[PDB]
Amino acid sequence: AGMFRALFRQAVEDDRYGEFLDVLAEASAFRPQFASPEACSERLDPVLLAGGPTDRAEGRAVLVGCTGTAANGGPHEFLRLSTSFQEERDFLAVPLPGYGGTALLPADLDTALDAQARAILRAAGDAPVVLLGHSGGALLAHELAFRLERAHGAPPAGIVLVDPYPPGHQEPIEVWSRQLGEGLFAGELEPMSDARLLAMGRYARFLAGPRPGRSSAPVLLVRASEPLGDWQEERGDWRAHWDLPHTVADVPGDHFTMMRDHAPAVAEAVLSWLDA
Amino acid sequence: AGMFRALFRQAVEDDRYGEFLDVLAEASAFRPQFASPEACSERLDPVLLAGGPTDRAEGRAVLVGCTGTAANGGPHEFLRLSTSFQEERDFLAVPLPGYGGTALLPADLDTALDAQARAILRAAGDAPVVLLGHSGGALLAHELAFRLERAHGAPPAGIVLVDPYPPGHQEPIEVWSRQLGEGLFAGELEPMSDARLLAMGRYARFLAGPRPGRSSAPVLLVRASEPLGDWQEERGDWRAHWDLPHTVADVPGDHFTMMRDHAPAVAEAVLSWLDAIE
């Protein structure tokens, strides 16, 4: 077992990361899947990683971390960032359906989003919700926001997109594909399972498909300040992008280190924005 | 076993054999490979599975079984058939490069063919060679024959194609793809490794590619007499095909049983043909 990981490693060495992700997406279609949010084969209950002031237990929006697609990710994704919200805001990390190796994969993105929506609404209660995601997780946070609005009549109070690269601005992901792939292998707490690599490929494909809806929630765009890899100035702007953001905040670090070594800066931008 | 095997199992269940084979081929591109026959991995030394009469050892053609693409196959493929050649003809089985991951996959078909050619010519000596293959192996036998002729200055003395379904004539085998998939699992002596499933996908892709060269070697076309699945005579002939074969022989059984339960019939047709050809 583990052939997908082996092929993956080779693809990165050969600078064919993008091509391999397509293969993962195609292969993933043959994994058992759940067609109903209710038929989800796993507990999506968010985990409380930080607690806000017990004092003003009034309305106050709660932060919900939308786990990204990285096959090397999981419950550890928001550990560093969340510490900065302790005594400031409750922070709930919600799992992405299909990971954690017999977990069923979602038949389509909306089905996975509904499963998450239900777990989130139950956990948040009457508190307003502000979704937060990084990279693939940022793209998922927005899709989730729109779903909550249209299928659960509950649009979040806001969306925090950390370093998103939406369709239309994928040149940096293409140019730095090798670093994005190496970054995945680096920082892996354990070897990525083929099941999780398949899940990653499936979500990547979901995010590339027709996604009409735009959330009415205000968005905070948090951008890395340093390029992940070499970039020829003539190509244009390598920085992350979102169309018509409510606020834009720049933080130190690159696509990866902005969260790894400068999470406090990210948290700081979020808190100041929430107050406003 | 491996994830690819698991996925393939599901693909077959869902009747999506063709689609998964395509996935296997695409994935095989990320496996280490050899671009030079001299750079090949394993030893392709043909194995002697049957011995012919000692009374003659100079002009009699020797049979060379060309291993097929099945990920569950290997050294076992021609065992049952070879039995009928004992005391009749030497029967050598040549491995298909890339199977047992470790084993490097050929960069292209010609590279694998060249590796096989070298091994076969070394083993055959001055004895003429008649290539024999079943299904995918039949297509491979002809491709090998052409390469032998075009790049090794040695066309084989003949080619035995057992139930080939060449490009332009594979609708029956595509319609019956589910049974092909079930046959693979229903025939494993051990779980098919993901490495061999990838090799199988890569060769399948090779054989679907453009290969205009036709061997000048005479062809014996052996066809199964029973359909592997449902067909409906309105659809046309479901049988295996080859353009203008020198001789055609029909044997009992289907695409698969012809090489098991009815292997003696296949061997009989071959021996009979070798005599007429010689």
Reported in sequence order, the residue ranges of chain A that DSSP labels E, i.e. its strands, are 33-34, 47-50, 62-66, 91-94, 105-106, 129-134, 158-162, 219-224, 247-251
Beta-bridged to residue A247, according to DSSP, are: A220
Closest partner residue to A194 (CB to CB) among B3, B14, B195 is B3
Question: A177-185 vs A17-28: helix axis angle to the nearest 10?
Answer: 60
Experimental method: X-ray
**Three-state secondary structure of A42-85:** CCCCCEEEECCCCCCCCCCCEEEEECCCCCCCCCCCCHHHHHCC
**The pair of three-digit structure tokens given for residue A176, joined into one six-digit string:** 């730095």
* Positive or negative torsion for Cα B46, B141, B26, B192: negative
Nearest to B141 by CA among B168, B122, B119, B159: B159
Torsion of CA A200, A202, A207, A208, to 10 degrees: 120
Number of H helices, E strands in chain A: 10, 9
Locate B48 and state its tokens.
Answer: 């002697």
Cβ atoms of residues A68 and A135 within 8 Å? yes
Distances B204 to A169, A192, B240, B255 between C-alpha atoms, Å? 37, 29, 17, 17
**CA neighbor of B132 nearest in space, from B68, B186, B200, B215:** B68
Helix count (H) and strand count (E) of chain B? 9, 9
Who contacts A40 (Cβ-Cβ below 8 Å, separation ≥6)?
A: A34, A97, A104, A106, A112, A115
Candidate list B142, B241, B255, B262, residue with the active-site label: B255
- Choose, from B84, B135, B177, B215, the residue flagged as catalytic: B135
Residue type, A59: G
Chain B residue numbers touching A7 (CB-CB < 8 A): 27, 30-31
Mutate to test the interface with A, among B8, B10, B13, B30 (most CBs of A within 10 A): B30
Domain boundaries, chain B: 1-278
Q: Within 10 Å of residue A157's Cβ, how many Cβ atoms? A: 16
What's the CA gap between A134 and A222, in Å, rounded?
9
Q: Confirm or deny that A230 is annotated as ligand binding.
A: no
Q: Identify the residue whose tokens are 């195609």.
A: A26
Resolution (Å units) = 1.8
Q: How far apart are CA B131 and CA B141, in angstroms?
A: 6
Q: Give the whole-angstrom CA distance, residue B19 versus residue B25.
A: 10
Measured CA to CA in angstroms, residue B70 lies from B1, B188, B216, B237 at distances of: 17, 10, 27, 25
CB A124: neighbour CB atoms within 10 A?
18
Helix axes A17-28, A3-13, angle to 10 degrees: 160
CB A64 within 8 A of CB A78: no
Beta bridge partners of B47: B93
CB under 8 Å, gap of 24 or more: what pairs does B186-189 form?
B187/B70, B187/B72, B188/B72, B189/B72, B189/B76
Choosing among A3, A102, A205, which should be mutated to test the B contact, i.e. which has the most B CBs within 10 A? Answer: A3
**Contacts of residue A19 in chain B, CB cutoff 8 Å?**
29
CB B184 within 8 A of CB B192: yes
**Is the separation of the CB atoms in A158 and A216 below 8 Å?**
no
Give A13→chain B minimum CA distance, Å.
10
Are B169 and B150 contacting, i.e. CB atoms less than 8 angstroms apart? no
For the domain made up of B1-278, give the CATH fold: Rossmann fold (3.40.50)
Nearest residue of A to residue B3, measured between CA atoms:
A1
- Nearest in space to A262 (alpha carbons), one of A232, A224, A227: A224
Distance CA A98, CA A113 (A): 12
Place of tokens 């696509």: A255
**Contact predicate B83/B105, CB 8 Å:** no
Quick one: chain A helix, strand, coil %, rounded to 5?
Answer: 40, 15, 45
- List the catalytic residues of A: 135, 255
Q: CB pairs under 8 A, 24+ apart, for A78-82?
A: A78/A49, A79/A49, A80/A259, A80/A260, A80/A263, A81/A259, A81/A263, A81/A266, A81/A267, A82/A49, A82/A50
* A1-276 maps to CATH 3.40.50.1820: yes
Helix (H) or strand (E) segment spanning residue A148: helix A136-151
- Asked whether the beta carbons of residue B14 and residue A26 sit closer than 8 angstroms, the reply is no
Distance CA B25, CA B201 (A): 4
